[PDB]
Symmetry: none
Subunit: 388 residues, 2 copies
């Protein structure tokens, strides 16, 4: 084995789709059709909790919501940020899953997809806060969340799985808007939830209290998504959509840097093959059907030489280009090193590339030759082994 | 399709930025980074020409310059106007793009931003002349341009695109003068022209002979613009700056009326979203960067109750308040009617609001979701269908 060297709990964080345990009739994002990842970890002695933040919201907003769900309180988005983007300053209120974070407890965050951007941004906020929010607060005389002060530190490690640290070219597809929401619908269907029914109960809450957006009594997911597509959580720059783009991701990278206090681990995925006498990449047998028909072919061919989107960008997992996943590179100075058997603090420990697609790595799409329980249990044992 | 009912060629007219086909070396105002709109219309059978008048000059001066660019001759600003504002009576001399117009036939004018004011003014002069220039000429025994005589029905239609018919609140910003010249600097840089380089060749000629202003070869645009800011083309009432203001635009609307023999079409643009609880408008992802940072915020929040500049004025395309675009209203009796399939004479046929910004709509800023070719080919086809 490795020997347990820390007792930090694990916290799970989803991407641009995702929801809590009570949502979606209980079908879990972390485990999908394969079972319940949190429960398996807990059952094996690794305390684990799950976060639910806005799937379409910006990394900043998600990071504010996460802090509040972890420590307890009302989501405070920052008076400056909120004035700039025109949404409320305050979101929902949470009991707090781990109030010991205020007195020295720490955590391990395991994040999938965009969750990896959100996790990085939370560590950077904890540590350095935000100069702009500090200055706005005193100038306008309003209160200020401790999150924007800096000098807090409570994340021992961040692990990212299939994260677009450098963006994904998928956002450059012509009909990206309609295709992105058809993807949402496909994930709904993997969970046995219909997109043409006005469910009285909520089932998938987008957490859009700040923008005043809420599914209406009598409205289906089809109709809701048509409104979301025309609303600020899709058309502004304060969105997941902007942060997912190669250029948006680079801007985030310019200010969200690795902390020397925190171990970073990265997992990459791929599920494509290289075509004959082309550099193009094509979806492998078994890739989730939606991505195989709709996303994988564009991802495996779109090039932009002027921007450095070359041959190495075409390999993908059906949603994100594989090269984007080992850690932030564009607009960043973080260091990335191949895992060599000893994890190191303050740099990206590239744990390699797995032959599994974007939704398979979380159980949402089946893949019987992928032993997902062993993957997560082994990751938990490594996290458990990190020196404090 | 529809049937063609006139042979009237199309003439393109820019706004408060704009330059000739051979200027800005090749980078075209009409088409920018997307291509060359005049060329598409020509290659698709729609005969088309391009005018280039003083970008910062008053609508009157532009109109006079436009007249002479079309029928040929030496520009004539009118002796009364010239002595009143203190600039030369005569400007440049042109061969004429369509001297045949002097003896019959017609044109369709498609004009963007302030070109729309200019087009409306040309039509009014063509049809009514100027009583004032008539009296002056007679009282002083001096010659008179046929432009001021009246009785010339050269224009079959005027289509406006993002025109500030009731003005734009941008002019009310605290540092409008400095920011306006930064806007010019930004359009230069979109064509790759630097503002700190002492270009020997003209590159972008402001066509300010009447005022004796011209950039000295080897003078940078930075330096030139500094002189323009302190010159009459920035400081007098005979300028674009004044006609683009709310009161200036109301004054123009008080005398430039819709002619009964001409079809007017307006296209409106918007690229902002409404804030959750402020009524304010905010720039959408994708809006050209200069506007999004420097202009759209002020536009989407500036109100002046005294003048009825309301919540409805806040929606914008990054340069002009959208409500200003469907046609003249402040100080006008023109009738404006939503398009219902048939274009009517002597009124404003409001063709709708498009989700495109001020520069995207002429191709100067990119927007892959906007099919700019089809937008122009459809319009041309519609203009070709008009019954004279
Ligand atoms: Ca599969
Ligand atoms: Ca754009
Ligand atoms: Zn926000
Ligand atoms: Zn003048």
């Amino acid at each position: 084995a490795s020997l347990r060297a820390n007792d930090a709990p694990i916290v799970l964080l989803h991407g641009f789709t995702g929801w809590g345990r009570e949502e979606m009739f209980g079908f879990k994002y972390w485990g999908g059709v394969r079972g319940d990842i949190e429960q398996w970890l807990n059952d094996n002695g690794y305390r684990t909790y799950t976060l639910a933040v806005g799937p379409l919201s910006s990394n900043w907003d998600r990071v504010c919501e996460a802090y509040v769900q972890l420590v307890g309180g009302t989501v405070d988005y920052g008076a400056a940020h909120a004035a700039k983007h025109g949404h409320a300053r305050f979101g929902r209120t949470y009991p707090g899953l781990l109030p010991e974070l205020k007195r020295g407890g720490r955590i391990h965050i395991i994040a999938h997809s965009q969750g990896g951007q959100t996790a990085r941004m939370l560590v950077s906020l904890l540590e350095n806060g935000s100069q702009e929010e500090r200055e706005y607060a005193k100038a306008h005389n309003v209160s200020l969340s401790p999150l924007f002060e800096g000098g807090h530190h409570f994340v021992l490690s961040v692990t990212t799985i299939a994260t677009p640290h450098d963006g994904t070219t998928l956002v450059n597809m012509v009909d990206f808007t309609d295709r992105f929401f058809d993807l949402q619908k496909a994930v709904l269907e993997a969970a046995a939830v219909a997109s043409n029914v006005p469910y009285t109960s909520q089932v998938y809450d987008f957490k859009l209290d700040q923008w005043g957006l809420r599914r209406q009594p009598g409205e289906s997911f089809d109709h809701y998504f048509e409104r979301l597509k025309r609303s600020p959580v899709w058309t502004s720059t304060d969105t997941a959509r902007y942060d997912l783009s190669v250029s948006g991701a680079e801007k985030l990278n310019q200010w969200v840097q690795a902390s020397p206090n925190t171990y970073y681990l990265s997992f990459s995925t791929e599920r494509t093959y290289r075509g004959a006498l082309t550099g193009n990449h094509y979806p492998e047998l078994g890739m989730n059907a939606f991505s195989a028909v709709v996303c994988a072919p564009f991802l495996g061919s779109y090039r932009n030489p002027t921007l450095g989107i070359d041959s190495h960008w075409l390999e993908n997992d059906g949603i994100v280009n594989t090269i984007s996943m080992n850690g932030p590179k564009r607009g960043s100075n973080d260091r990335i090193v191949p895992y060599d058997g000893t994890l190191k603090k303050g740099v990206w420990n590239d744990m390699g590339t797995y032959n599994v697609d974007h939704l398979e790595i979380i159980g949402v799409d089946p893949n019987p030759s992928f032993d997902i329980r062993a993957f997560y249990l082994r990751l938990a044992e490594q996290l458990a082994s990190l020196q404090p």
